Amino acid sequence: VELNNMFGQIQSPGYPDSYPSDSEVTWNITVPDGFRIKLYFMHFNLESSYLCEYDYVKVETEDQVLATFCGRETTDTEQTPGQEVVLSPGSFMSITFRSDFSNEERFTGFDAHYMAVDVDECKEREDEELSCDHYCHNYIGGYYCSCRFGYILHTDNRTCRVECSDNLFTQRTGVITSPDFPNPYPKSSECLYTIELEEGFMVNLQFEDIFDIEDHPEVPCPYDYIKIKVGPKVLGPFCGEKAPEPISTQSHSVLILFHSDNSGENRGWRLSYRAAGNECPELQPPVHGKIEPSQAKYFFKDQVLVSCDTGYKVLKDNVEMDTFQIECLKDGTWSNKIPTCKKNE
Amino acid sequence: VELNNMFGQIQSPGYPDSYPSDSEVTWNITVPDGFRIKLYFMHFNLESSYLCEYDYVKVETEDQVLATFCGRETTDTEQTPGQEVVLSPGSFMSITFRSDFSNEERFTGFDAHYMAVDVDECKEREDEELSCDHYCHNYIGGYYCSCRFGYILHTDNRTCRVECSDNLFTQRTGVITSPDFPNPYPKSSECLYTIELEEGFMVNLQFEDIFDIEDHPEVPCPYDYIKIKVGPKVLGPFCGEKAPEPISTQSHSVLILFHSDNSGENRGWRLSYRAAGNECPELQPPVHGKIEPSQAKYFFKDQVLVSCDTGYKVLKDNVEMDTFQIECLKDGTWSNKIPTCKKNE
């Protein structure tokens, strides 16, 4: 007897009359995926025996015996089902009623009822793998995942990624971190951090605070990683609990690529960058004059104005002027030499 | 936007970005019969207004407004949904998101989730009509009724009838009742009680104890009733709280028909019957003899033996004998006259 549906009733042969001897009936119950089987009895009147060897109602799956019943509900300290519900672990349940050759006493058999019960994948998933990254939503026959505001559900319909490439660092100094640092970084993400400075600046990179990127003890960064592209060269990949040593580039532009796979709760990383340059030589103020601003050292694009004392003016070639402006160039040289001061005579 | 299924997600236009102005979207959610709609929100960010007149999320049925939401979940003492679930009374739910012409502030809208929820017809049915007579069984998408052991589920798939015609009363006296008397009699049943005595007996009927058959104040027995067929004549129908007066039939056979409809909890009835007959005249013992058994009155089929004293014998015609047997016939006459006793001389 084969049966696939959502509910049903099962009775012993002859019910409500006494069952015949030498009878064996099997009922196979299959429900769709995402459902389990719930079974209970309204009447149970069978012959009692050791391990229910003679007459019995056997409830099982394809590889597991769930329960075996016999005896009469009237007499107690018995192997009867009573008010107990039999729940299948999966979407299949097999029931066998067996009656041997000896039916001296007239037992009336049983009356059973079953139905499909929705599996709540959300309250079992935490004991599994392979569960919703953020939110889990249960429904009749299945489930689905959703994400926190500002996150995007990935192609796996499970993990929550972010858009982390809409950036451009143009300032002389700055801070760059993994998304939500130092909280666990978003899974299944591909972050592109771009540092773009003017021609002549050189970017220095320095990691700080927590550094936590998922790694492997034998294989170099097979899960998550940082790659740093400077010129036609890629540095890394970088991962683990130890940040790479400070990086001094000879470039005004740097690309930081941060890749995260579909697994882990690692805290991420943080770095600070600084745009340096070539150091210009010490400047000596002209006789009867001055140079502003007075700095210990001068770097690329630094501007200085040369001035003279009252009663004197700056002399360029054989031409007089109030101030002259010089700048520290990319190659580490000044735009011009320091001119002299000429009296008003 | 039309949507018929078991689950789903709904977002405001532009989500997760700010919604556009002058927009109006309606989502119609229909589920199969035996299901309701469950609705909740994960994000809600709207403009706040008196009775949500400007921007709003309106949740309604075909004839009833369930809820109206507006405002931002951040600010409290608001008209936001929060963690509250909106449950539809039936299998239909309509949702309208409206945005007016004024979207100065940039509200991010909403994120909603819905699913079909099984109706448990068993826990609401008692507040209805038209419910399971005995047992109610709930399942996903519907329900069904079943009956107590010894009862049969009627063609209405709701009421529980019995087989109450497998009887035959042949004894001189007896008791007949409605099934399970004095407990409520089974609905949708047709009971045939047959009294069959030998030719010459006359059945007398007498109701006793509780008499409770569903009746109507204006119409004679339109629901449940007793009909009594004696010969080619039917007595009744009988119903109500008052039993009919004792019935003296002139018949050895009586049929009692008891009809019960699909409604009520009336206790029923009980009667006792007695098979009478014609009374035979007083018998006088013969001179020098006796008659056994000595009774006050004699009725149909009563047997008596005529005997004589020691030294005498019964005389029939001119023939001597030890005992003579006479019987009380159907017509109220004796089979023979009392013979005399003759000495042994």
Ligand SMILES: *[C@@H]1O[C@H](CO)[C@@H](O[C@H]2O[C@H](CO)[C@@H](O[C@@H]3O[C@H](CO[C@H]4O[C@H](CO)[C@@H](O)[C@H](O)[C@@H]4O)[C@@H](O)[C@H](O[C@H]4O[C@H](CO)[C@@H](O)[C@H](O)[C@@H]4O)[C@@H]3O)[C@H](O)[C@H]2NC(C)=O)[C@H](O)[C@H]1NC(C)=O
């Ligand atoms: C309704 O559900 C019922 C319950 O699941 C199912 O009934 C059967 O369930 C048992 C498990 O499937 C089954 O027992 C099996 O019998 C196998 C013997 O037959 C196979 O091998 C021979 C050759 O030797 C072939 O000629 C046959 O065609 C057949 O392929 C036996 O090999 C098997 O044992 C192995 O597998 C189990 C898996 O759990 C291992 O634990 C075990 O160690 C072995 O490796 C197993 O015993 C049994 O016959 C039957 N149950 C009863 C009570 O009779 C119904 O078939 C299913 N209905 C439908 C329509 O599919």
Ligand SMILES: *[C@@H]1O[C@H](CO)[C@@H](O[C@H]2O[C@H](CO)[C@@H](O[C@@H]3O[C@H](CO[C@H]4O[C@H](CO)[C@@H](O)[C@H](O)[C@@H]4O)[C@@H](O)[C@H](O[C@H]4O[C@H](CO)[C@@H](O)[C@H](O)[C@@H]4O)[C@@H]3O)[C@H](O)[C@H]2NC(C)=O)[C@H](O)[C@H]1NC(C)=O
């Ligand atoms: C998706 O579900 C939506 C919500 O139920 C539904 O949208 C509509 O829902 C309202 C109720 O059905 C509807 O309002 C009705 O409008 C009727 C006016 O149009 C009718 O009459 C004119 C002639 O006057 C005809 O030309 C039209 O073709 C049409 O037949 C109006 O008569 C009606 O009011 C009566 O009925 C209600 C019943 O509850 C009584 O309370 C009331 O007293 C009146 O007797 C009612 O107001 C509305 O237009 C619309 N909602 C919105 C927000 O626009 C969708 O139609 C449904 N989708 C599908 C595919 O069916």
Ligand SMILES: *[C@@H]1O[C@H](CO)[C@@H](O[C@H]2O[C@H](CO)[C@@H](O[C@@H]3O[C@H](CO)[C@@H](O)[C@H](O[C@H]4O[C@H](CO)[C@@H](O)[C@H](O)[C@@H]4O)[C@@H]3O)[C@H](O)[C@H]2NC(C)=O)[C@H](O)[C@H]1NC(C)=O
């Ligand atoms: C999260 O993960 C899965 C996988 O990303 C998502 O489900 C997907 O499932 C399949 C692809 O594996 C898609 O189904 C197909 O859609 C086609 C377009 O609608 C349709 O034509 C296909 O039907 C036929 O397919 C073959 C022929 O190609 C044939 O043998 C069949 O008999 C059909 O006639 C088929 O349905 C899904 O579209 C796809 N996406 C979605 C949105 O479901 C899910 O999002 C999700 N899964 C779970 C379980 O959560």
Ligand SMILES: *[C@@H]1O[C@H](CO)[C@@H](O[C@H]2O[C@H](CO)[C@@H](O[C@@H]3O[C@H](CO)[C@@H](O)[C@H](O[C@H]4O[C@H](CO)[C@@H](O)[C@H](O)[C@@H]4O)[C@@H]3O)[C@H](O)[C@H]2NC(C)=O)[C@H](O)[C@H]1NC(C)=O
């Ligand atoms: C308790 O009450 C009802 C009523 O007694 C029970 O359900 C019954 O419902 C209908 C009769 O109203 C039956 O359904 C039909 O069964 C036919 C044989 O299987 C089948 O051919 C029919 O299909 C077609 O019907 C018409 C053509 O005649 C056509 O328009 C349709 O499109 C179909 O193609 C139809 O399904 C049921 O068989 C009947 N009995 C049962 C057991 O369901 C129920 O027992 C119960 N109802 C509830 C809700 O509890």
Ligand SMILES: [Ca+2]
């Ligand atoms: Ca057990």
Ligand SMILES: [Ca+2]
């Ligand atoms: Ca047995």
Ligand SMILES: [Ca+2]
């Ligand atoms: Ca589920």
Ligand SMILES: [Ca+2]
């Ligand atoms: Ca963010």
Ligand SMILES: [Ca+2]
């Ligand atoms: Ca670790």
Ligand SMILES: [Ca+2]
């Ligand atoms: Ca990882």
Ligand SMILES: [Ca+2]
């Ligand atoms: Ca409310």
Ligand SMILES: [Ca+2]
């Ligand atoms: Ca507005």
Ligand SMILES: [Ca+2]
């Ligand atoms: Ca139900």
Ligand SMILES: [Ca+2]
């Ligand atoms: Ca009974």
Ligand SMILES: [Ca+2]
């Ligand atoms: Ca009453």
Ligand SMILES: [Ca+2]
């Ligand atoms: Ca009635």
